[PDB]
Amino acid sequence: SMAEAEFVYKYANNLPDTHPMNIRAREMAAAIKAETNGRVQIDIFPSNQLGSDTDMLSQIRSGGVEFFTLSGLILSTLVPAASINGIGFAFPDYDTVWKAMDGELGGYVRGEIGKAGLVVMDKIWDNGFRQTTTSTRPITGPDDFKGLKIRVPVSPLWTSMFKAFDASPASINFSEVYSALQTKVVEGQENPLAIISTAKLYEVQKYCSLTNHMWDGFWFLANRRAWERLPADLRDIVARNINAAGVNQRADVAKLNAGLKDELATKGLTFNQPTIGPFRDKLRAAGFYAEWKGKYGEQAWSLLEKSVGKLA
Numbered sequence: 001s002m003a004e005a006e007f008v009y010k011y012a013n014n015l016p017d018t019h020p021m022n023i024r025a026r027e028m029a030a031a032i033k034a035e036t037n038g039r040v041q042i043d044i045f046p047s048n049q050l051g052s053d054t055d056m057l058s059q060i061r062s063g064g065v066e067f068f069t070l071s072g073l074i075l076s077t078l079v080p081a082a083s084i085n086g087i088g089f090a091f092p093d094y095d096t097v098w099k100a101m102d103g104e105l106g107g108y109v110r111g112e113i114g115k116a117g118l119v120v121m122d123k124i125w126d127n128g129f130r131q132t133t134t135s136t137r138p139i140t141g142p143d144d145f146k147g148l149k150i151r152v153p154v155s156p157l158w159t160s161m162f163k164a165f166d167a168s169p170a171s172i173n174f175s176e177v178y179s180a181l182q183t184k185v186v187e188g189q190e191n192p193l194a195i196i197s198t199a200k201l202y203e204v205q206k207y208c209s210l211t212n213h214m215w216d217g218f219w220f221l222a223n224r225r226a227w228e229r230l231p232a233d234l235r236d237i238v239a240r241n242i243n244a245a246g247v248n249q250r251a252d253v254a255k256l257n258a259g260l261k262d263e264l265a266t267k268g269l270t271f272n273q274p275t276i277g278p279f280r281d282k283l284r285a286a287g288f289y290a291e292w293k294g295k296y297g298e299q300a301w302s303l304l305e306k307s308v309g310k311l312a
């Protein structure tokens with residue numbers, strides 16, 4: 001038989017194999033294997049094949065897997081600073097997002113991730129600005145969130161935000177979301193359009209409300225020991241290829257989130273665009289911005305403010 005590659009590394013993720021994350025990860029793995037002359041093989045385990053997000057967070061820490069893409073908000077139980085990009089209504093556009101995440105704010109978060117003992121690639125991958133879906137009624141204003149049994153990912157930031165909206169959040173890994181919606185364990189969830197599409201959540205929801213309540217992405221994490229075990233030449237090749245795949249993935253995801261509404265509207269989702277201001281007002285009145293300013297500290301909060309104020 002053919003000898004195994006010297007380094008056979010596992011990359012786990014939580015998304016469908018049809019999402020740009022996985023399309024680009026497959027291109028990335030092929031490029032890496034060729035460029036390292038067969039020395040590095042990245043085996044990809046999409047859509048929670050090896051386990052759920054909370055499981056994989058444990059595994060990237062312990063070395064059970066070598067690579068894992070993860071929202072900073074989920075990561076934030078280990079790295080408290082890493083939820084900072086998810087502050088409600090903070091970023092007005094992608095322009096400010098990438099300048100921040102590829103600039104000083106992202107540098108700050110990456111440094112915090114390093115302090116916790118993980119490696120993280122320079123470029124965060126996209127997920128997108130998040131919308132709401134339900135099987136009950138549309139969300140036209142913040143009053144409609146009262147009592148809503150809404151699924152959220154496991155994170156203090158998501159819990160805080162949806163409690164501030166007077167909803168009843170349930171913390172559930174993405175792997176259980178389709179079934180939880182289908183069976184009405186929960187009444188709704190929130191995610192970018194590209195997720196609603198690729199995970200077919202339109203099959204098990206009726207309404208999509210464009211609440212546009214945060215932007216979030218996926219840090220590309222590496223187990224530190226496994227990263228350091230790669231010789232320097234291979235490390236450089238792997239890092240370059242992961243970041244290149246990320247840049248392409250961002251471009252793919254931006255196009256999907258910009259254009260998917262019309263397609264989703266003919267697949268079993270009825271859309272509405274609520275007026276956004278009252279939602280931001282509700283988070284303010286609930287003390288959400290004051291809470292998180294306190295938790296992140298003045299320096300980090302000032303860095304977030306600097307980041308979102310850009311006009312270009």
Ligand SMILES: CC(=O)[C@](C)(O)C(=O)O
Binds near residue numbers: 127153190
């Ligand atoms: C944060 C994240 O990984 C997802 C897929 O968007 C989610 O769990 O909803």
Ligand SMILES: [Cl-]
Binds near residue numbers: 210271273
């Ligand atoms: Cl609409």
